[model samples]
Target chain A: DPDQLYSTLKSILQQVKSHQSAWPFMEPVKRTEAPGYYEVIRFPMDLKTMSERLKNRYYVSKKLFMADLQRVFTNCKEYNPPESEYYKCANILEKFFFSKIKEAGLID
Target chain B: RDPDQLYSTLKSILQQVKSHQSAWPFMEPVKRTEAPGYYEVIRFPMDLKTMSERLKNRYYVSKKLFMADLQRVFTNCKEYNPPESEYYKCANILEKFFFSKIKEAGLI
Candidate 1:
């Protein structure tokens, strides 16, 4: 019984260790009914790349496209920024997002 | 509409405007799946899959009234800066995705 208990806890600790809570990016994206869609949301890519790739491959309305981007952005915003490519992706998005604020008179 | 708090205000409006009450023929009651009581059709965040399906084409509820309501929400959020209200986040998603369609239709 003691041996079984030890293994259960060990497995839990291993699971916890695998996850990095500080970075939401590190956490796997929860899949929606559609596969690859939500996963792609969590994947590291510039908004430029995202916009172009979707344009090249698929047909999506601008309305839906913006919703997807906002969904991804909101999820991404939940955590503090991480290093390397992660920073670059969000950094570029901030460039696009903040600039839109001007159009809405969110800023002068 | 108070600039400091919008969602709490939404709560009150939503409460008084019961499921039975319907001056708006267009503002149909889209049940929240869980309860029978009607809620205002502000932002739909049911789930990602549903959101995508609904936004497959441009979606709206009395576009005239809806847009006017959104304008108030958006204006309030933008004016009260520093700590962006979550309502601002909600408004941004719809505006980001759906407003692009409006621009295309020469609604600018």
Candidate 2:
């Protein structure tokens, strides 16, 4: 049953990461692209990092998975200006991610 | 009134919660070995010790942020433990005390 939940979460992550708007978030942001990003963002999250954590069994519960997943959006929003492309992508992808979570019945 | 004064009050309240009898269970982070499936069920692991460190680091820039993290501690405890459990009771009692301190400080 535990492993079943793990697979389900992985499937959800796959859907989110493959979306077109997910391009900006598929990998970790580069220092060359955004100066002082690490200094501003305490927890820098990306889909690839989440994938690695999933592989490591870091997500014991759906909530933990959701927390890291949500952080991908939050951290983006925090560091990027609202008018920036990255921020808009975070907004779009966050909505998609939440819908997937709802479809999975992870949160009511 | 100012940020420094607010920080001082928040620190004071944190100390009170740390010293409370009902705070024993939450004084430190819950270990995965200590409680089975704890990491799986609790998405965000919080404790008084972590809060103390956060306070020192000025992680809480606003009263709302401070209140949310403290509330997260109680919420996680109640969610993970049954109503009849001692941890649930501790959360309830200490939460009441925490709210009282917040009110006393004119925070809420």
Candidate 3:
């Protein structure tokens, strides 16, 4: 029963990562790439981190998974300039991610 | 709560988190001998002992500051270890316990 839950969660994340706008969030933002990134983002999250966590069974519940995904977008929007592509992707990818989670019946 | 009151609250919460059964692996730093390359992957290593020391030194200025280090303990563990490992499981379980105390104290 729980196995199916994780399976669906993984499938959902895969689809989100496959999205065109997901490029900005596939991995941790390098300090060199974005100076002062760590100073602004207290809790960072990324699709790669999520994938590894899923592979290692770190998401025990759907809520926990949902929370991390939420963090990815939150941190993105928080640290990036409002008009930047990264901020736009956070908005776009978040909607797409929510749609997939809904398709999976992970959320209402 | 006042700053002094918050300090006591954090100390109490930290004590509870430190004493939890799942907190064993994170009571101290992960030795290089025990977890090779741990320091390499996890740049900001956090543990219960270090948190306690920080608390004693009045390093945490707000509940959010205390919360960040507490979260880092679990985040760092999940980043470095496989999910099926006891260290990862301990981080997950203990993180939940720690958050509940935070919520109970109305820190969130």
User: Candidate 2's residue-wise lDDT over A1-108, tens digit each?
Assistant: 648888899999999988999999889999999988887666788999999999999999987997788778766765665567987787678667766876787754
Q: Where does candidate 3 clash, by residue pair?
A: none
Candidate 3 displacement at residue A77 in angstroms: 20
Query: What stretches of model 3 exceed 4 Å from their correct place?
Result: A1-108
Candidate 1 wrong stretches, greater than 4 Å: A1-45, A57-59, A81-108, B1-108
Q: Scoring model 3 with DockQ, what do you get?
A: 0.02
Q: Once model 2 is optimally superposed onto the true structure by TM-score, how far is the C-alpha of residue B36 displaced, in angstroms?
A: 33
Tens-place lDDT digits, model 2, residues B1-108: 578888899999999999999999998899878897888777789998999999999998887688768867976775566556798778766866775676567663
Q: For model 3, how does the per-residue alpha-carbon lDDT over A1-108 read when each residue is reduced to its tens digit?
A: 749988898888989999999999999999999977787667888999999999999998987998899789757754555567987787677667656765776643
Which predicted model would earn the best DockQ? 2
Number of the candidate with higher lDDT, 1 or 2: 2
Report the candidate with higher lDDT, 2 versus 3: 2
Give the alpha carbon lDDT tens digit for every residue of B3-39 in model 1. 3233333333333322222212213333458323323
Model 1 clashing residue pairs (backbone): A63-B97
Provide fnat values for all models in the order shown. 0.00, 0.00, 0.00
Residue-by-residue lDDT tens digits, candidate 1, A5-94: 334333332332243332323234545532553432344332344445454643233343334444444445322233434434443453
Q: Name the weakest run of 10 consecutive residues (lDDT summed) in model 3 chain B.
A: B75-84
